Amino acid sequence: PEPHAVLYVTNELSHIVKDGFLPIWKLTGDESLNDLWLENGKYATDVYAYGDVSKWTIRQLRGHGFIFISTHKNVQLADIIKTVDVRIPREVARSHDMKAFENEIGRRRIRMRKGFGDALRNYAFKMAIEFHGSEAETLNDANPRLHKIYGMPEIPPLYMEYAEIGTRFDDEPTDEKLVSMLDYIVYSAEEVHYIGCGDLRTLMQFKKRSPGRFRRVLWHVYDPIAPECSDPNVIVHNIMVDSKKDILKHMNFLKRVERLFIWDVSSDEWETTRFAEDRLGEEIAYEMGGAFSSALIKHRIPNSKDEYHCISTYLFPQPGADADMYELRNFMRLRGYSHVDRHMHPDASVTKVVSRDVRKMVELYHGRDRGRFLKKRLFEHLHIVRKNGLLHESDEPRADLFYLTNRCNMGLEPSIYEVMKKSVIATAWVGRAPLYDYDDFALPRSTVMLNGSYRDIRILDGNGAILFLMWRYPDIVKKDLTYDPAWAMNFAVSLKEPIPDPPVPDISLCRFIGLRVESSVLRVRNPTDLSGHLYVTLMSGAYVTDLFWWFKMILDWSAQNREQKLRDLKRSAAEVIEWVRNDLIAALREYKRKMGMREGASIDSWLELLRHL
Numbered sequence: 001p002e003p004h005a006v007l008y009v010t011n012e013l014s015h016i017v018k019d020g021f022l023p024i025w026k027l028t029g030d031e032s033l034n035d036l037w038l039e040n041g042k043y044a045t046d047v048y049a050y051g052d053v054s055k056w057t058i059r060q061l062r063g064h065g066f067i068f069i070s071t072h073k074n075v076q077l078a079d080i081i082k083t084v085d086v087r088i089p090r091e092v093a094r095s096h097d098m099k100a101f102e103n104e105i106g107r108r109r110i111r112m113r114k115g116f117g118d119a120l121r122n123y124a125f126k127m128a129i130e131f132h133g134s135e136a137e138t139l140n141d142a143n144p145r146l147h148k149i150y151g152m153p154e155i156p157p158l159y160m161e162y163a164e165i166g167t168r169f170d171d172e173p174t175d176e177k178l179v180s181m182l183d184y185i186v187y188s189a190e191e192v193h194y195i196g197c198g199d200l201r202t203l204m205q206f207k208k209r210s211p212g213r214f215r216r217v218l219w220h221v222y223d224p225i226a227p228e229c230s231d232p233n234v235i236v237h238n239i240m241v242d243s244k245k246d247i248l249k250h251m252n253f254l255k256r257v258e259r260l261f262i263w264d265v266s267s268d269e270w271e272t273t274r275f276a277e278d279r280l281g282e283e284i285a286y287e288m289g290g291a292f293s294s295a296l297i298k299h300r301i302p303n304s305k306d307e308y309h310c311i312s313t314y315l316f317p318q319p320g321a322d323a324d325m326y327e328l329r330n331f332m333r334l335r336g337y338s339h340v341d342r343h344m345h346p347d348a349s350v351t352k353v354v355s356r357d358v359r360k361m362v363e364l365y366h367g368r369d370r371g372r373f374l375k376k377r378l379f380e381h382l383h384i385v386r387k388n389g390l391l392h393e394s395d396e397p398r399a400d401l402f403y404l405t406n407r408c409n410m411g412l413e414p415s416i417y418e419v420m421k422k423s424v425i426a427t428a429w430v431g432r433a434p435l436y437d438y439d440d441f442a443l444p445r446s447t448v449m450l451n452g453s454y455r456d457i458r459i460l461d462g463n464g465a466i467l468f469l470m471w472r473y474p475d476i477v478k479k480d481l482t483y484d485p486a487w488a489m490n491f492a493v494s495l496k497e498p499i500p501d502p503p504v505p506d507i508s509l510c511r512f513i514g515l516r517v518e519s520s521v522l523r524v525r526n527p528t529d530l531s532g533h534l535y536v537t538l539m540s541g542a543y544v545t546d547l548f549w550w551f552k553m554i555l556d557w558s559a560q561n562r563e564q565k566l567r568d569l570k571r572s573a574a575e576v577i578e579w580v581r582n583d584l585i586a587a588l589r590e591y592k593r594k595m596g597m598r599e600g601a602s603i604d605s606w607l608e609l610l611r612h613l
């Protein structure tokens with residue numbers, strides 16, 4: 001709604017800014033701490049800034065909403081040599097185009113969102129087993145042998161029983177069909193038996209594009225014309241496969257493994273031949289259910305037969321395949337050890353298939369300019385347990401990133417807050433701006449604050465949350481992190497992190513940029529200073545900070561003694577940007593008196609906490 005970034009530019013760039021429409025802030029070395037706070041608070045949109053910032057720390061500037069823009073690689077702060085957030089190209093300078101400049105900021109700004117989400121997700125991989133609302137981004141960074149990845153991803157085009165097709169979706173080009181094949185099927189299997197591997201160029205391109213999951217897999221590759229492979233995890237068989245026996249002998253049963261069976265067999269007047277090969281791969285796989293978690297079989301659609309049968313779980317289109325390529329892939333979910341619970345996918349069984357509807361699929365989804373989003377969706381569908389986060393009761397520590405306040409969850413605040421009470425890390429959208437390429441509804445900030453904060457649950461806005469993690473987990477979230485503080489501030493974040501001790505007033509907790517303007521805006525619009533501070537912060541709907549920690553910092557810490565309290569700030573490795581019980585309860589009473597029903601509990605909860613503690 002109101003959070004803004006300070007778009008800071010270096011000197012060589014400063015002149016272009018002056019001729020724009022956003023406001024301009026000229027510093028000037030000194031600037032005391034309080035100067036910045038009262039100056040920055042005057043601005044209600046994003047603002048440009050230039051001049052000397054070198055005596056300020058990164059976290060101080062981030063608490064202000066600073067984004068660093070320059071032609072140069074970095075800027076010298078008081079703390080670190082900070083990597084430039086937005087690097088303005090030479091040609092962009094220079095032609096002095098104010099529009100191209102701003103579009104440069106904006107594009108790089110959209111790219112920085114990933115940095116914000118990734119920092120939160122990395123903390124979550126360190127602290128959680130369960131992941132809800134997941135998609136390819138989570139799978140990609142997950143240890144499939146430890147993490148459990150759940151979600152409700154957009155289901156791809158499939159075929160069973162049954163039938164549905166389309167509807168059609170817009171799509172983009174991707175990798176060549178056969179490496180794309182490995183792309184969506186390879187995720188949790190430790191061992192792959194690949195029959196009909198060919199010349200291995202396909203496998204070697206997978207190694208090149210995906211070093212990680214290639215290396216973690218043991219590859220048994222079968223083909224009479226297969227060349228040598230000096231890769232230690234590629235065991236090469238020049239055997240022609242006609243029975244399960246050819247595969248059983250290259251297995252170690254005395255050790256537990258998830259195995260995947262991949263069949264791409266084809267040969268050199270008709271091709272009832274091609275049919276008996278596809279059927280064979282399926283049959284071999286079915287016989288070997290119990291040893292294999294899953295199978296992917298080559299599936300060419302016959303020309304003569306209008307209907308026919310096969311052994312399948314799903315049949316789907318192939319990403320990167322040609323428009324005229326009348327071939328699908330047969331996914332078979334089997335029994336056999338697996339790091340992913342795929343029980344929701346029906347056991348592979350005998351399936352009737354009408355050529356015509358399987359003919360449409362090709363025509364709807366294939367094409368050398370299609371496949372990118374198909375590939376994504378196949379990947380997510382095969383490898384994520386379909387579960388509704390709000391309805392799932394868990395035994396393991398869980399993470400709940402970027403899904404709660406998706407529009408599909410509208411009007412389900414109770415169960416949303418129920419997640420935020422127990423999640424290790426959860427996010428909720430609170431942004432009120434009107435607010436593009438993002439389809440979430442906003443939770444009222446004051447409600448979040450009042451419901452979210454517990455002894456064990458830390459509740460902060462996105463930027464606060466990051467600054468907290470910078471401070472508490474220095475190599476989970478580095479100081480040098482490129483991210484957009486305004487963006488971060490569209491989210492509330494809850495953390496399973498104990499109140500700090502001493503309960504110091506760190507930036508993560510206390511920024512309150514714009515508070516003075518907000519009190520005036522409250523008074524000229526809806527009228528009724530430590531008590532006024534609380535009443536304004538809540539009533540403004542502009543802030544998300546942690547009440548529990550804040551109440552702890554106010555009473556237990558602050559008086560105190562100026563000297564012996566910084567000291568406990570030093571020490572705490574904490575910084576700031578600013579240098580009673582009956583007052584706080586007066587604020588809360590005034591707040592609930594201005595709005596009952598629409599809140600609050602909770603409120604009474606904090607009220608009956610302050611008058612006891």
Ligand SMILES: Nc1ncnc2c1ncn2[C@@H]1O[C@H](CSCC[C@H](N)C(=O)O)[C@@H](O)[C@H]1O
Nearest residue numbers: 133134135151152153388389401402403406
């Ligand atoms: N109530 C709910 N339960 C389970 N999944 C949900 C959900 N509401 C939305 N989702 C799903 O969550 C996904 C949001 S994309 C979020 C990606 C991921 N959590 C991350 O860290 O970036 C979408 O696939 C959406 O379908």
Ligand SMILES: Nc1ncnc2c1ncn2[C@@H]1O[C@H](CSCC[C@H](N)C(=O)O)[C@@H](O)[C@H]1O
Nearest residue numbers: 178196197198199202223240241264265266
């Ligand atoms: N019974 C069988 N067992 C293993 N491979 C077989 C086979 N019958 C035919 N083949 C092999 O199957 C291959 C099909 S070419 C398949 C393309 C290959 N997977 C690639 O990506 O390059 C042929 O090279 C042929 O040698």
Ligand SMILES: Nc1nc2[nH]cnc2c(=O)[nH]1
Nearest residue numbers: 113114116117118137402
């Ligand atoms: N900040 C942010 N990061 C992401 N990474 C993946 N998705 C998102 C998102 O929606 N927001």
Ligand SMILES: Nc1nc2[nH]cnc2c(=O)[nH]1
Nearest residue numbers: 136140183184375376379
């Ligand atoms: N198949 C596949 N699709 C993706 N889309 C985004 N990441 C991936 C991936 O790792 N594999």
